[PDB]
Ligand binder design. Structure first.
Ligand code: CLA
Ligand code: CLA
Ligand code: CLA
Ligand code: CLA
Ligand code: CLA
Ligand code: CLA
Ligand code: CLA
Ligand code: CLA
Ligand SMILES: CC1=CCCC(C)(C)[C@H]1/C=C/C(C)=C/C=C/C(C)=C/C=C/C=C(C)/C=C/C=C(C)/C=C/C1=C(C)CCCC1(C)C
Ligand SMILES: CC1=CCCC(C)(C)[C@H]1/C=C/C(C)=C/C=C/C(C)=C/C=C/C=C(C)/C=C/C=C(C)/C=C/C1=C(C)CCCC1(C)C
Ligand SMILES: CC1=C(C/C=C(\C)CCC[C@H](C)CCC[C@H](C)CCCC(C)C)C(=O)c2ccccc2C1=O
Lengths: 34, 139, 30, 90, 107, 161, 80, 732
């Protein structure tokens, strides 16, 4: 596979960091009074 | 009129069914009544308590808990001398029930009708006519 | 076969699509 | 809920009479019932003849016969227009 | 459990047709049916069935054959009880047929 | 024959169905002595199986490739005994039951307590009704044309919409 | 809160007021019916939406109608 | 306290219900606080641009991942032997047996094998290399960006369309028929004539040379002469090897009929002539309506004039035009019903007349595609009725529709519901009765007493199209008939070969098992329709709740009075019909898949004999074909069917979890949650942490929805694992 390093870079970020960041910021947004 | 906070409470051994943190930070309800006897009743939140001869006072978390006890005492011990109060964490006490000294099922002058609709229930408006309009479906 | 530079061209255009997706989503959100 | 637009020249076409008003014929509102009835019979015969001449269809057909075969469904609408005009006194 | 217990040992119940154990083969299917039929009562609500009964009552009214004992959908509690009874019958009956055909053939 | 099917009397697979069905019984009969009750029972079954296959062969049924008799229900008269004639028999019995039950429900409406007549049935009156059903097509059609079967739309309760 | 309506088919039987567990309803004077009184709903902020009033009402279609609306701590019946 | 910004009633809820209800109501813009009709139509327009961009991103992603990680160039050389690759696998939870077991496809990395058929589709339409797959993925990425920008632009103040534009039905119909349907069908004919057909004949045509390579040797001169038949001369021979020059003809517009003998797919020149004729017909259709130049029809006038004079339809269609234009739910119901019928036609006509080269030899792809589009069809068909119920509750005005077709439907709704109840019982009693009869009789060792009805009506329809298998000799099967002789010059020689070879799925042979399953399908369609129709027609009112329209579409119940009113809303009839839709598509896809796998072995008699009783379906379909699936891993190892073997169990789990929401109801769970709230408040070191939202049990309607989602997801995942793994494991 060409640019074979890409799954090993992008899959942990997309599968762990991206949901951890949207869960954190969605949690903050849905629980703010203003 | 106002709640005399010093009224002794019915003897009770405690339970887990009583009020929680929302009572001291949102609202608590109180019920007072006069008993001719020192007799056992059932608490809305749990087991059995004993009401003291004379005047009693409880604190409950819900208004419905105060009214459930009030119906129980009226049927079981023929006591109608019950007053239900709402108490806020600012200390302000709100008299609730019976609201004007007379029970709701007995008529009283100076009561203004709220919620009364001048036609029967089938004469309401269909939802389409009041769509994108603020006009109410009750005619 | 596809070169890595071609993959990087695809990632640039998908990034531009992400920026336009955010701007449309914010307009829809008001 | 909001005004629904229709193109300019939209008129009332609802009818509860024996026949609709002649306005339902569009550009054919002024044609007489005799002319629709004769055109309908003419179109039915020419359309049926042209249809019959090309029922075994081949890779190379006569193009005029193809176009003339479209007169058979058109004749149905013509005799309906003849009934509408005869019952409108036209 | 799915493969080596249920699938492997259901061989005797599902191959039982034409033998003396074909009764267990039929009760296996019949109880599978009753179990599924129970979920009609468990997943549904009374108000739908009362409104459906209204249209069926209309068709009886049309032919002047409406009963004097007015039909009702079962109560909320009875709907739950009918669903639970047919669920228990179908699940236990399927196990009964499977257990008995399996152990009569191999034991 | 019809729809590429074969009459069961000359299909060879129907013949193999009969032969396999009899060998299955004979191998069970091979484990019993002659005058025993299991031997008598299995011989009765062998005779019953042979009788059924023989009767089906001569009945005009049409077997498929499988050798199992198939039913033709398109309306042709050569196969009317498979759906049309059983269907006429059914509709007579079903219309009888419907006519008789309707007659009892209309009688029970004119009773002292109409709902007591339906959980405690007046058996002489209900047997009077069950006997009347033999001429239900004429009775029900005369009921229809005399304006007594169908009730008008404005004596029927309907929903608001 | 929930919205509770009383329609003018009310015969003044007081059954809804006795059945209400949260003191939402009361009786007011009205010349429309034979009983001379009609139900009223002055305290709908305390309505929990139980619809015991609707069960108690004997008119053909209910004179009292509860319309479940926005939920609060009171209308959710939460002691926490 | 501000998440449901579109709803002040939800944003003041102090419970966890606010989060759930705010998420589930987000796309119902009509109910949001302060919504006008202007703002409603403009948000719908922009979110339609966003949906279109999502579709183009999904297509570009599939093309990119195949171009990058697939074996399209190896597959294109040998399409019946190579297995297409969907995308590569990078999973750090894998063991080395799993990494090795998924390393199929002729590559050095784990991969999913594609069941979507995109290799056969891209091959047939011209794609040959990885680089033009990549060029196509970059084009779709650009188009996705263009439609994202167009959505943002038409929300800007000068570019926001008015309501008069959004309700100009006549113009939209003219442009969508002649441009969106007709012109794009004509342009797709152009792509096939200019690119796909030359590349099926070995000649590469791309953007670098397509202006100097003529599709036909004569070249646009027979078209401008009326010598159109010169484009049908010399079609592809039956010796043509697809993709190469051997056996190739020069025709570009033919009507041969039947299948290309080597690809087992329809001829590409038939497909090109189909799209040319469809394009011309739809462009003609798009000149019907009057826009700005005085020719054409007013839609309002056509609806107003179609009242039969006998009076049987009342006022006819007067006032229908106003209701349809104003109501978006009526438009949604018509669009979804229409779309649902097409995706069912897509499922039925693509397995019987496949268009892609080398498809129909891939059994997993054929099974997956049929199952996929029938499930999409069932969902679309349920949604059409759901939005018709929402139309009656929300958008239907009885005073603008006096004595219409709509009002007269509501005037005899009891007759329709009662008749639907009768037909469903009439089908159900006797279909279940014949099946149970056969079961008992086979079980007692006597299969010759079965009730086996020959499906003569459908066999007669097959014979009318030329099937010479049942000796009916009618129409096309009759050699000397007016029907057969009329088409003898064109379609009849090729079509007769196609329909009378027993090597394809054109008009599959049928018997008693097909009769019984068609009657079961009919019962399922009637019962699903009964619940959906009853839900739509009783939506406004009934005898239990005559004022049901004042409460909306989705409300829990009317309480325990009047006998009990659980599931009385029109939404609850959507809910109840979803189980019957799942049951219906289950019976349909079980039938398709069992009949096809038995034909693919050469053992059609196994379906013919076992399908007439229910134990044949239980042991010879579910139990027999389960074994390669449930052995995807075992104590002796694992293979590449392990993932489907896991998904199978996963599907059994979710489905059963749905039962918990459907059988147990709210009051129990609220009392549990109150004991947990007490325990948290009383536990030291844990009561330092506090909820912002009060934990409550799910609502009555929400729990019905959660149980339905879990049930449906379990249904889909279980069947997808079975239909893919059993077909892969068996290969037949
Ligand atoms: C709808 C389109 C789609 C889908 C479902 C996938 C799916 C996948 N991609 Mg992606 N990919 C896509 C488009 C898509 N691709 C496009 C267009 C490109 C070109 C720029 C790529 C480039 C790409 C790379 C370079 C890699 C993947 C990888 C993967 C896999 C792991 C997930 C991951 O790391 O994501 C990462 C994906 C990206 C960074 C690309 C952006 C994703 C798209 C454009 C956004 C789509 C949003 C969607 C429409 C809506 C989402 C919201 C939802 C809640 C409704 C998975 C098979 C990895 C892989 O092969 O592992 C084995 C990997 O390394 N993809
Ligand atoms: C969606 C994609 C995804 C990916 C890429 C991973 C990746 C991984 N998982 Mg998995 N996991 C996932 C989803 C995923 N997880 C889900 C959904 C579940 C629930 C079912 C699990 C449950 C699970 C368990 C139960 C275990 C793993 C383990 C592992 C590790 C593999 C084993 C190894 O080599 O040990 C090497 C692993 C390490 C040396 C530790 C990595 C620690 C990371 C790199 C620190 C990152 C800091 C953190 C993410 C900050 C993020 C903040 C926020 C924004 C996200 C690896 C890190 C195993 C593990 O934890 O290994 C110890 C393990 O025991 N996973
Ligand atoms: C069954 C189908 C049908 C029917 C009954 C009609 C009927 C009619 N059409 Mg329509 N039309 C149709 C299909 C149909 N059309 C289709 C498919 C197209 C697209 C090509 C058109 C496009 C069309 C145009 C563009 C016009 C008509 C017009 C007319 C009217 C002409 C009468 C006439 O020729 O007088 C002799 C008549 C009311 C004309 C009219 O006045 O419309 C109101 C007109 O200008 N038709
Ligand atoms: C799906 C539609 C359909 C319907 C409604 C019928 C209905 C009928 N068919 Mg069938 N048929 C069909 C399709 C259908 N057929 C097809 C597709 C075929 C294959 C070509 C046949 C082949 C077929 C044959 C071969 C015959 C029928 C006959 C009949 C009639 C006999 C019933 C009767 O007792 O009436 C007639 C009797 C009375 C009115 C009174 C009797 C006391 C009946 C009208 C028979 C007939 O008589 O034809 C008219 C007959 O011989 N049908
Ligand atoms: C003898 C009484 C009688 C009569 C004449 C009818 C007549 C009818 N019913 Mg009703 N029905 C009855 C009893 C009766 N029903 C009973 C007892 C039940 C409860 C199980 C129902 C439940 C029912 C449903 C659910 C439906 C009908 C429907 C129909 C119609 C079509 C025929 C049909 O579908 O049969 C169907 C028959 C049944 C489902 C049950 C019949 C049960 C037995 C066999 C009949 C009753 C026997 C009775 C005890 C007679 C005693 C007589 C004795 C006292 C002398 C028709 C209007 C359908 C409709 O509305 O179509 C428009 C429909 O959907 N019926
Ligand atoms: C092109 C198709 C299409 C479109 C535009 C809509 C659009 C809509 N539907 Mg319909 N629907 C569809 C297909 C469609 N649906 C299909 C196929 C089904 C069958 C499964 C349904 C079944 C259906 C029901 C039963 C309901 C809707 C509702 C809704 C509305 C709100 C959706 C929402 O808030 O959830 C958004 C959800 C999320 C963002 C979370 C994921 C919205 C107007 C609901 C409504 O508000 O009606 C008044 C409602 O109750 N729809
Ligand atoms: C195997 C499961 C199963 C079965 C058989 C049924 C059967 C039926 N459903 Mg139900 N349903 C089910 C599951 C099931 N459903 C589930 C899971 C759901 C989702 C919640 C629904 C939701 C649902 C709705 C919403 C509707 C139906 C309807 C129907 C009817 C449609 C078929 C028909 O009209 O005639 C088929 C008739 C039968 C199958 C009856 C069987 C005959 C019996 C078994 C006779 C045997 C008598 C026997 C001697 C009794 C022994 C008693 C013993 C004590 C001695 C029928 C009663 C519709 C309806 O009522 O239409 C009028 C309807 O509106 N169902
Ligand atoms: C309402 C009932 C009903 C429904 C929905 C269907 C539906 C279907 N049938 Mg079935 N069928 C039925 C009744 C029904 N049938 C009956 C009663 C018979 C006679 C046994 C048949 C015989 C039959 C054959 C032979 C075939 C089908 C086929 C099919 C399919 C294609 C359409 C067709 O041929 O219509 C058939 C429609 C009718 C026959 C109309 C029936 C309408 C009336 C009201 C039903 C009752 C008639 C009554 C009881 C008989 C009167 C008495 C008589 C005995 C004297 C479709 C699944 C075909 C198919 O594709 O199979 C795979 C096929 O070849 N059906
Ligand atoms: C559901 C949804 C919600 C709301 C409504 C909605 C908007 C309509 C809808 C749409 C959602 C949509 C359409 C969502 C669309 C989402 C998309 C298209 C996301 C794409 C993400 C791509 C990324 C992050 C790639 C970045 C590449 C980089 C940084 C590479 C950079 C580089 C490399 C190495 C090489 C080159 C040089 C540099 C530049 C250095
Ligand atoms: C709920 C509801 C409330 C009100 C609003 C609402 C949204 C509109 C509504 C929804 C309603 C819904 C959801 C309605 C759904 C309606 C549907 C799915 C209607 C299906 C129609 C199919 C037809 C007429 C096929 C005809 C085929 C033919 C004639 C083939 C013929 C033939 C040809 C030419 C070729 C072969 C030979 C033969 C057989 C001769
Ligand atoms: C089908 C159904 C009905 C309707 C069912 C009815 C009206 C039962 C009527 C069936 C006939 C009238 C009697 C059944 C007799 C059978 C032959 C078996 C008898 C079993 C013993 C009781 C004799 C409900 O009322 C209901 C209520 C709440 C949740 C779910 C449901 C539900 O699913």
């Amino acid at each position: 596979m060409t640019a074979a390093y890409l799954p090993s870079i992008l899959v942990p970020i997309i599968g762990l960091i991206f949901p951890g960041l949207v869960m954190a910021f969605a949690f903050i947004y849905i629980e703010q009074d203003e | 009129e106002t709640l005399n906070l010093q009224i002794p409470s019915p003897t009770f051994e405690g339970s887990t069914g009583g009020w929680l943190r929302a009572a001291e930070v949102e609202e608590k309800y109180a019920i007072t009544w006069t008993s001719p006897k020192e007799q056992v009743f059932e608490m809305p939140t749990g087991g059995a308590a004993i009401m003291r001869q004379g005047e009693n006072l409880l604190y409950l978390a819900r208004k419905e808990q105060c009214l459930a006890l009030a119906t129980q005492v009226k049927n079981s011990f023929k006591i109608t001398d019950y007053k239900v109060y709402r108490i806020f964490p600012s200390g302000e006490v709100q008299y609730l029930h019976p609201k004007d000294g007379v029970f709701p099922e007995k008529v009283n002058a100076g009561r203004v009708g709220v919620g009364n609709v001048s036609h029967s229930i089938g004469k309401n408006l269909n939802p389409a006519q009041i769509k994108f309009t603020s006009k109410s479906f009750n005619g | 076969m596809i070169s890595d530079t071609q993959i990087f061209i695809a990632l640039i255009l998908a990034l531009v699509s992400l920026v336009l997706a955010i701007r449309l989503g914010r307009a829809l959100y008001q | 809920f909001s005004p629904v637009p229709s193109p300019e020249g939209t008129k009332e076409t609802y009818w509860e009479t024996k026949a609709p008003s002649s306005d339902v014929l569009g550009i054919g509102a002024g044609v007489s019932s005799g002319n629709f009835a004769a055109a309908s019979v003419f179109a039915a015969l020419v359309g049926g003849y042209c249809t019959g001449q090309v029922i075994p269809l081949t890779v190379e057909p006569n193009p005029l016969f193809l176009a003339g075969s479209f007169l058979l469904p058109y004749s149905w609408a013509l005799h309906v227009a003849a009934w509408i005009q005869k019952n409108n006194g036209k | 459990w799915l493969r080596d217990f249920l699938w492997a040992q259901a061989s005797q119940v599902i191959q039982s047709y034409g033998s003396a154990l074909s009764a267990y083969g039929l009760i296996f299917l019949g109880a599978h049916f009753i179990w599924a039929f129970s979920l009609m009562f468990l997943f549904s609500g009374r108000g739908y069935w009362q409104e459906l009964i209204e249209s069926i009552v209309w068709a009886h009214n049309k032919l002047n054959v409406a009963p004097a004992i007015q039909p009702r959908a079962l109560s909320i509690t009875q709907g739950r009880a009918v669903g639970l009874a047919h669920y228990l019958l179908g699940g236990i009956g399927t196990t009964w047929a499977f257990f008995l055909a399996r152990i009569i053939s191999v034991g | 024959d019809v729809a590429g099917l074969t009459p069961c009397g000359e299909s060879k697979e129907f013949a193999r169905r009969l032969d396999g069905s009899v060998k299955k019984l004979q191998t069970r009969l091979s484990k019993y002595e002659a005058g025993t009750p299991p031997a008598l029972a299995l011989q009765k079954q062998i005779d019953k199986t042979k009788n059924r296959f023989d009767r089906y062969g001569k009945a005009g049924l049409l077997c498929g490739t499988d050798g199992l008799p198939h039913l033709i229900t398109d309306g042709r008269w050569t196969h009317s005994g498979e759906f049309v004639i059983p269907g006429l028999l059914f509709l007579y019995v079903a219309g009888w039951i419907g006519w008789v039950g309707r007659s009892y429900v209309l009688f029970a409406r004119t009773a002292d307590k109409p709902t007591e007549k339906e959980i405690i049935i007046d058996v002489p009156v209900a047997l009077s009704f069950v006997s009347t059903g033999f001429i239900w097509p004429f009775s029900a059609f005369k009921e229809f044309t005399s304006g007594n079967l169908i009730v008008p739309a404005d004596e029927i309760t309907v929903s608001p919409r | 809160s929930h919205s509770v309506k009383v329609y003018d088919t009310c015969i003044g039987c007081t059954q809804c007021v006795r059945a209400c567990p949260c003191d939402v309803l009361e009786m007011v004077s009205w010349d429309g019916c034979k009983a001379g009184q009609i139900a009223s709903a002055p305290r709908t902020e305390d309505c929990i939406g139980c619809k015991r009033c609707e069960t108690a009402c004997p008119t053909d279609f209910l004179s009292v109608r509860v319309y479940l609306g926005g939920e609060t701590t009171r209308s959710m019946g939460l002691a926490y | 306290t501000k998440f449901p910004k579109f709803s002040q009633a939800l944003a003041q809820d102090p419970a966890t219900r606010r989060i759930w209800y705010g998420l589930a109501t987000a796309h119902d813009l009509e109910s949001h606080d302060g919504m006008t009709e202007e703002n409603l139509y403009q948000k719908i327009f922009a979110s339609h641009f966003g949906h279109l961009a999502v579709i183009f991103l999904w297509t570009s992603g599939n093309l990119f991942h195949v171009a990058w990680q697939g074996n399209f160039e190896q597959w294109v050389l040998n399409p019946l032997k190579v297995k297409p690759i969907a995308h590569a696998i990078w999973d750090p939870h894998f063991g080395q047996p799993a990494v090795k077991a998924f390393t199929k496809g002729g590559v050095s990395y784990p991969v999913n094998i594609a069941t979507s058929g995109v290799y056969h589709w891209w091959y047939t339409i011209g794609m040959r290399s990885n680089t033009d797959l990549y060029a196509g993925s970059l084009f779709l990425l650009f188009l996705a960006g263009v439609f994202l920008f167009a959505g943002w632009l038409h929300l800007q103040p000068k570019f926001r369309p008015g309501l008069s534009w959004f309700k100009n039905n006549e113009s939209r119909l003219n442009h969508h028929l002649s441009g969106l349907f007709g012109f794009s069908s004509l342009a797709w004919s152009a792509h096939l004539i200019h690119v796909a057909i030359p590349e099926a004949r070995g000649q590469h045509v791309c953007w670098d040379n397509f202006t100097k390579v003529a599709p036909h040797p004569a070249g646009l001169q027979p078209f401008f002469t009326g010598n159109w038949g010169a484009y049908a001369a010399s079609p592809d021979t039956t010796n043509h090897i697809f993709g190469t020059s051997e056996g190739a003809g020069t025709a570009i517009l033919t009507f041969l009929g039947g299948f290309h003998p080597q690809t087992q797919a329809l001829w590409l020149t038939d497909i090109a002539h189909h799209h040319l004729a469809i394009g011309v017909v739809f462009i003609f259709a798009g000149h019907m309506y009057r826009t700005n130049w005085g020719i054409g029809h007013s839609l309002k006038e056509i609806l107003d004039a179609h009242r039969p004079p006998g009076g049987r339809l009342g006022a006819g269609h007067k006032g229908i035009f106003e209701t349809l234009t104003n109501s978006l739910h009526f438009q949604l119901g018509l669009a979804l019903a229409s779309l649902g019928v097409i995706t069912s036609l897509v499922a039925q006509h693509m397995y019987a007349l496949p268009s892609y080269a080398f498809i129909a030899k891939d059994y997993v792809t054929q099974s997956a595609l049929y199952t996929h589009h029938q499930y999409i069809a069932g969902f679309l068909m349920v949604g059409a009725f759901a939005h018709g119920a929402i139309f009656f509750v929300r958008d239907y005005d009885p005073e603008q529709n006096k004595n219409n077709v709509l009002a007269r439907i509501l005037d005899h709704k009891e007759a329709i519901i009662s008749h639907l109840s009768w037909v469903s019982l009439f089908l159900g009693f006797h279909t279940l009765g014949i099946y149970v009869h056969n079961d008992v009789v086979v079980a007692f060792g006597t299969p010759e007493k079965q009730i086996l009805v020959e499906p003569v009506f459908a066999q007669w329809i097959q014979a009318s199209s030329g099937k010479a298998l049942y000796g009916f000799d009618v129409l096309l099967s009759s050699t000397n008939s007016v029907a057969a002789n009329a088409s003898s010059n064109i379609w009849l020689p090729g079509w007769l070969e196609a329909i009378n070879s027993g090597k394809n799925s054109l008009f599959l042979p049928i018997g008693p098992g097909d009769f019984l399953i068609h009657h079961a399908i009919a019962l399922a369609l009637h019962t699903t329709t009964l619940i959906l129709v009853k839900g739509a027609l009783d939506a406004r009112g009934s005898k239990l709740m005559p004022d049901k329209k004042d409460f909306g579409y989705a409300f829990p119940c009317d309480g325990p009075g009047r006998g009990g009113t659980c599931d009385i809303s029109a939404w609850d009839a959507f809910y109840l019909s979803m189980f019957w839709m799942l049951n219906t598509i289950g019976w349909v896809t079980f039938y398709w898949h069992w009949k096809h796998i038995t034909i693919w072995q050469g053992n059609a008699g196994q379906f013919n004999e076992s399908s007439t009783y229910i134990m044949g379906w239980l042991r010879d379909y579910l139990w027999l074909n389960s074994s390669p699936l449930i052995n995807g891993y075992n104590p002796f190892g694992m293979n590449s069917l392990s993932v489907w073997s896991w998904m199978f169990l996963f599907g059994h789990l979710i489905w059963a979890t749905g039962f918990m929401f459907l059988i147990s109801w709210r009051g129990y769970w609220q009392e549990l949650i109150e004991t947990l709230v007490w325990a948290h408040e009383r536990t030291p070191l844990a009561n330092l942490v506090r909820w912002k939202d009060k934990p409550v049990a799910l609502s009555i309607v929400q729990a019905r929805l959660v149980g339905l989602i879990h049930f449906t997801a379990g249904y889909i995942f279980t069947y997808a694992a079975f239909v893919i793994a059993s077909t892969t494991g068996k290969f037949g």
